[PDB]
Structures are given as C-alpha cells and as structure tokens.
Scaffold this active site. Sequence first.
Site, short mmCIF file in Angstrom:
data_model
loop_
_atom_site.label_atom_id
_atom_site.label_comp_id
_atom_site.label_asym_id
_atom_site.label_seq_id
_atom_site.Cartn_x
_atom_site.Cartn_y
_atom_site.Cartn_z
N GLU A 85 27.30 5.74 -12.26
CA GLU A 85 28.68 6.23 -12.34
C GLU A 85 28.86 7.08 -11.05
O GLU A 85 28.09 7.99 -10.80
CB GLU A 85 28.97 7.06 -13.62
CG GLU A 85 30.44 7.47 -13.77
CD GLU A 85 30.70 8.25 -15.08
OE1 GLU A 85 29.85 9.08 -15.42
OE2 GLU A 85 31.73 8.07 -15.78
N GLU A 130 40.22 12.87 -14.47
CA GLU A 130 39.32 13.14 -15.58
C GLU A 130 39.55 14.56 -16.07
O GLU A 130 39.84 15.46 -15.28
CB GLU A 130 37.85 12.98 -15.12
CG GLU A 130 36.82 13.37 -16.20
CD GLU A 130 35.40 12.87 -15.96
OE1 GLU A 130 35.16 12.05 -15.05
OE2 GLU A 130 34.51 13.32 -16.72
O1 LIG Z 1 34.28 0.85 -25.71
C1 LIG Z 1 33.64 0.86 -24.42
C2 LIG Z 1 33.98 2.12 -23.58
O2 LIG Z 1 33.28 3.34 -23.95
C3 LIG Z 1 33.69 1.86 -22.09
O3 LIG Z 1 34.37 2.67 -21.33
C4 LIG Z 1 33.61 3.63 -20.63
C5 LIG Z 1 33.20 4.75 -21.55
O4 LIG Z 1 32.42 5.68 -20.82
C6 LIG Z 1 33.03 6.40 -19.78
O5 LIG Z 1 32.26 7.16 -19.30
C7 LIG Z 1 32.36 8.61 -19.20
C8 LIG Z 1 33.09 9.00 -17.92
O6 LIG Z 1 33.20 10.42 -17.80
C9 LIG Z 1 31.95 11.10 -17.73
O7 LIG Z 1 32.13 12.52 -17.58
C10 LIG Z 1 31.15 10.81 -19.00
O8 LIG Z 1 29.83 11.40 -18.98
C11 LIG Z 1 31.01 9.30 -19.18
O9 LIG Z 1 30.31 9.04 -20.40
C12 LIG Z 1 33.49 5.31 -18.78
O10 LIG Z 1 34.16 5.92 -17.72
C13 LIG Z 1 34.38 4.27 -19.47
O11 LIG Z 1 34.78 3.24 -18.57
O12 LIG Z 1 34.03 0.56 -21.63
C14 LIG Z 1 33.53 -0.53 -22.38
C15 LIG Z 1 34.07 -0.47 -23.78
O13 LIG Z 1 33.57 -1.58 -24.56
#
Ligand SMILES: O[C@@H]1[C@@H](O)[C@H](O[C@@H]2CO[C@@H](O[C@@H]3CO[C@@H](O)[C@H](O)[C@H]3O)[C@H](O)[C@H]2O)OC[C@H]1O
Length: 189
Positions: A85, A176
Amino acid sequence: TIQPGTGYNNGYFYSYWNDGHGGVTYTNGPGGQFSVNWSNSGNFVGGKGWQPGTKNKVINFSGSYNPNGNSYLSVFGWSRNPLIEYYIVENFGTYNPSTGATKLGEVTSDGSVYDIYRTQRVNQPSIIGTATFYQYWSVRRNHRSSGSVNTANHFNAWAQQGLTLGTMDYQIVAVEGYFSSGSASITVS
Ligand SMILES: O[C@@H]1[C@@H](O)[C@H](O[C@@H]2CO[C@@H](O[C@@H]3CO[C@@H](O)[C@H](O)[C@H]3O)[C@H](O)[C@H]2O)OC[C@H]1O
C-alpha cells in the site's frame, strides 16, 4: 453519497472504502472531480484515478482540502506480488503518518523535498483480504492541495532504497480519514 465500492465515472476509475462506522459521504462529480464530507467518521479512503496504475504516470490534482483532525491527501494505490500500500502525501491534518517511522532517504520532486519511510500493517484489511503488508511513503515537506506528481521520481527513489513494488493495482488521488471530520473537493487528471 454513493455506495462503497469501485467502478468508473466519467471516464475515471474510483474507489470508496470505509470501515462501516458512519459519518462520511462520498460523491462523484463531472470529469475527474470528487467530493468528501465527513463528521465524526471511522476509517475511510476515497478518490478518482486509474485501474491499473502505471510506474511513470504524471498525476495532476486541484481543489480544496479542509480536514479537522486526522486525515491525508495523497497519490495513493496498491501493488500485488508483493502486496504494498503506497502513499505520496501532499497534505495532512493533525497527524504526520511518518511519526515514529524510520527515515529511509529523501527525494526532490515537483517543487519540494519529500522524506521516505516504510511501515508495516499487521492483520489489516487489504485488496486481497486481511493480511500483513508493508506501506511505502513519500511525505511532502511543503503542504499543498493543488499540484502535479511525477510518480516515477518516487517509485525510482523507493526502489533505489530497497522498497520495490510489484504489479500495479489501482492508483488514485485519495482523501483518507481516521476518526475525524472535514470536507474536500478535488479534481484529477
Ligand atoms: O471488500 C474488499 C475491500 O476491503 C477492499 O478494499 C480495500 C480495503 O482496504 C483498504 O485498506 C485500508 C486503507 O487505509 C489504511 O489506513 C488501512 O490500514 C488499510 O487497511 C483499501 O484501501 C481498500 O481498497 O477491496 C476489495 C474488496 O473485496
């Protein structure tokens, strides 16, 4: 607002995700525009861009960003294999996301020096499910809510320092938040 999820709007990919807490609305506007309004939210991420991203895209953003509490404004995305990420952070609210992280270098780009860091998430949501994964960061010293980001300068500096990316999943300009309030209106291209 729109329903959390992904898709296309007026030619741009978008992704709107939240943790289900409530207190956040996300709207898609004309062209590359999106808005976010939030009041006592949980954790959320929303924005417009591309799917998949590339490793040399020049990304332009313009508009307003008014957080009250913990929030980021960044060029944001993921890679697969390895799962990463990543963030090129242009502005933030009450929290610098690199607080307590180890500094792994500097890169100059698009009118500012940025500081480079790596952090780790343990058993957190991701594009592939709950997982443990690294995060890469470039944090801009001179904060702004309009500009141009030459992503290649960041990805190349990260690789130079040992922070390598896999295959590119989505790549957007994202707002965010984490348990905060605010408003934002951003146009991408
Ligand atoms: O249902 C699923 C979703 O959860 C997925 O989307 C992602 C979910 O996790 C996100 O991540 C967070 C971003 O922000 C940070 O601070 C956190 O620590 C992360 O966990 C991500 O950005 C989303 O895209 O997509 C797939 C679906 O099936």
